[model samples]
Target: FATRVISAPKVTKKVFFKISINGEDAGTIKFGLFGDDVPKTAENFRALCTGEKGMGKLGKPLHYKGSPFHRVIPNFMIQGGDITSGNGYGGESIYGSKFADESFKITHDGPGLLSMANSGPNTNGSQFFITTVPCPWLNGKHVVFGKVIEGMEIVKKIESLGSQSGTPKAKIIIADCGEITEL
Candidate 1:
């Protein structure tokens, strides 16, 4: 009669995100990578932030163009990351980033948190959204890769745009993200 031994998930990956809007002191964000789940996507974002490639290799960033925080429900949240453009029915849009396994069960409504945007089912593209309030509903439906640990106020500024119909008056970018602590 052998005893059963269950293993725990490994989450020692510490990543840092240099968040900014229109290139300002937006602040730093820290998040642990869930390699046990979304390994590639997590590592890819970390590599890009660490600058470990040639031109466009790491910094060849994709603009979430023609995208906006299209859905803003107060006490709820603002959900964008919709890649459907123009006809909104022609086809699904995306780059090299593919949706990984939603094994982590993270959510989208946590303040200063970013989440992958899924379109009906397991359709996750490069789209994502940020939050200004504490949204617990998102705890298990979405994968929260990272959180705005430092520049939450900058996020607050962006969230303010929810009143103006979801589109930010300015632009926000990943700027830089890497495994500073892990290194």
Candidate 2:
């Protein structure tokens, strides 16, 4: 898809997340950021990787890890990332750091790909979902911002987190995040 020689600039580092449930190593999540389409989205997420100023410093991920992944449908998939109440109720976490540029963006419906999950159009906050299954229905619903290239097993660990109704039973934390460069 990268046809433009001048346009396809070689990327250097990507950020990897080390998710821990209360200090316990859950697993790692490697994400591939898309700059061509959602430059703001990719840049914003990358900026959140470190901080002193990253999303951690902002408040939490919809910028902080609002809640751990608790809903797991083995053959289906797992869902979580609610900063509001950990159940699709959290909102307004990244108001100051939000932007829109999805005109050339790709669709969501694959594994390891980062997509924005919002209540409505352009409402993407700190809430997002990682697909454990091929969610074709989500095809054009959300913007695919990035993907997990490694540490996918960590998603399983997130599924292992306790859940009630549709939320995590216990809280899992993002111990640290590092940069992901290339294969």
Candidate 3:
């Protein structure tokens, strides 16, 4: 019998996010791409962060800039990345079309989980979320792509702000985004 080996590309740099909410400095959230663990999903996310084109575009940047965390659930999670409308429902893949969900060995075991948001299986687009606390119920259903290296406090501060029907009172704008050496 022969054993088959499979692997995805290794992550070369640490992916970092610099976010600002309500016109003041919020904080930086740094994480690593799970390229080897989940290639397609990570690739999609990485491209979006760097604004690299994937497919189905007419030359518009697909970066997360100007997007807001449309939904913020206290003690739960903050969702965003809808470049189309900045709402939970609006977003598209860097590929210009919805991609299938990659099989994940990870889980939402704790806070700062960077995972894909989908309406159903294999419907991943540009939407993602960061948990403020562990959410076991979301295990397996969502693809955990990155884990926050720092700035959980900033995430919590956004969570602390009051919400109306899940929308934050003020937009938590992602002013800029790109892979960085440090946050």
Candidate 4:
């Protein structure tokens, strides 16, 4: 018998999100950003997590600290990062309201892969999603810049709250988030 080994990308930065569902602690999900592969995209997410960029174009703070996981599809993915609107409609990048797609070098070959959520080409902003299962159809479209390196169980917990229509049953919030300095 043989098993395929999926080699992980070089993680240049580490960040975390402490999740809460219905105002209760869920757990933390640590992500390893592919800074070397997608520097611009990775840096945007990193800064957003820390909210170090201050306010965005929409007058809302550029942060992921209190935003909700507005969309969730069980066995599929969980989408969020709309710090501007909290729903799936609005968000602003650290660069501005929006930015061009970095590069589709990384593939959505497995679950836990993190990629941008956009309406059309070069429309990337603060919104992103994490795959709960392999999503090859998204390849060459979404810019995959990171992956969940720890706390996949927490992600699964969030996935369980989703409806068939990608809406979570309860408010799944990113109660806390920031860059992790230690290795």
Candidate 5:
């Protein structure tokens, strides 16, 4: 008999962000951060959602609220969290400008898997992307810290507006965001 294996990392925290596309409410995307597996990385994302860390190194509020999903690749991923520039060019980690990749324990095995977006190794910041499809190519490069627990339909809705250049036809914004306390 073969032994059973549970590969899913333990979720330590819950967070949510409400999205608005071109001024219309799309929906909320709730995430379960694998804090037990990637504590530092997950905490950065979590604090940024709640803006509890106040200002970032970039002199901008370290929050995901009001920031736009700057990049969107249909059938790929939707990228955002550029709290500084609101483009793919700039973002700041809750720790500082950048931080090291926690661990690649979680793979981009399926859609709605949340992972950091960075230019190179140890460059993680507030930037992150939500996979819309299994992205095997990004397995070793990006740090997977969380997963979308609900509202994948909203992700699909955002994906529909993406273009070949990874830009959305309409502005996809994080209208509201914060940590969710367990009831």
Candidate 6:
């Protein structure tokens, strides 16, 4: 018996997101989404970025725009992506609940790696964090969805505002986030 083969190469279309901190125009961080590696995770994040997906009890927009980095740990990571609530408490997925974790052979091995933030295993939602340093301990615990392709300085600037609780003194809002086809 012969098996049919799927032909043609899959075109990898990169999805990029921009993050602005306060009034810093230069603080535009672009992240290249791992579409091929993590399809569901990327689709979920892409929907959140474009605000096409709805979230929360009040049916709020699941856009990263205007959301601040609730937790910013210097030399550690910058966390945000809470659509429903600005704080770390409220975050909803496109699925309306935590989705099962995905493995794409990606790990939190270095800075600028975008990983999903969760309370524990099998609990990945809208919350995500950008590492500013290599974090080996985070391996297998979180889903590395993407990575910062630009504006590490902006990430550093955001990291500089860390406090006793890793919260920024001034709000470092995402401002707006949209998809980009190329780098």
Best candidate according to lDDT: 4
Give the runs in model 2 whose Cα sits over 4 Å from its true position. 1-13, 52-67, 70-88, 91-98, 101-104, 160-165, 178-183
Which ten residues in a row are the worst by lDDT in model 4?
1-10
lDDT by residue for model 1 (26-73), tens: 676565555666665455445544545323322433333333345544
Clashing pairs in 4: none
Per-residue lDDT of candidate 3, residues 1-183 (tens digit): 535452432443466667777887687877677777887888788878888673335344577877888898887888888887665778888776788878767888888878988998889988999887898899878988876767777788888873646778776888777786554
Comparing candidate 4 with candidate 6, which one achieves the higher lDDT? Answer: 4
**TM-score (all chains, Cα) for each model:** 0.57, 0.70, 0.85, 0.95, 0.95, 0.85
- Report model 6's TM-score to 2 decimal places: 0.85
Tens digit of lDDT per residue, candidate 5, span 76-113?
99999999999789999988658998898789999999
Task: Name the runs in model 6 displaced over 4 angstroms.
Answer: 1-26, 55-58
Those runs of model 4 whose alpha carbons end farther than 4 Å from true positions after fitting are 1-6
User: How much is 56 displaced in model 6, in angstroms?
Assistant: 5.0
The stretch of ten residues in a row with the least summed lDDT in candidate 2 is 50-59
Q: How many clashes in each structure? A: 2, 13, 0, 0, 0, 0
lDDT of 3: 0.77
What ordering of candidates by lDDT runs from best to worst?
4, 5, 6, 3, 2, 1
lDDT of each: 0.51, 0.59, 0.77, 0.94, 0.92, 0.78
Tell me how far the alpha carbon of residue 32 in candidate 6 is from the true structure, in angstroms, after superposition: 0.6
Preferred candidate (lDDT higher): 5 or 6: 5
TM-score order of candidates, best first? 4, 5, 3, 6, 2, 1
- Among these predictions, the greatest TM-score belongs to 4
Q: Residue by residue across 1-183, what tens digits does model 2's lDDT show? A: 855574332333477777777667777787767776677666656655543243433355434443545454453455555544654565333337444536434655556666666665666655566776677777666666776767887776666553434456556665666465444
Per-residue lDDT tens digits for candidate 6, residues 1-183, read 525452322223344445555666544677777778787888888888877765555466777777778998888998998877789987878877789988837877788888999998989888899999999898988888877767777888888888757878777888777776444
- Judge candidate 1 at residue 80 and give its lDDT: 51
Residue 8 of model 2, lDDT score: 31
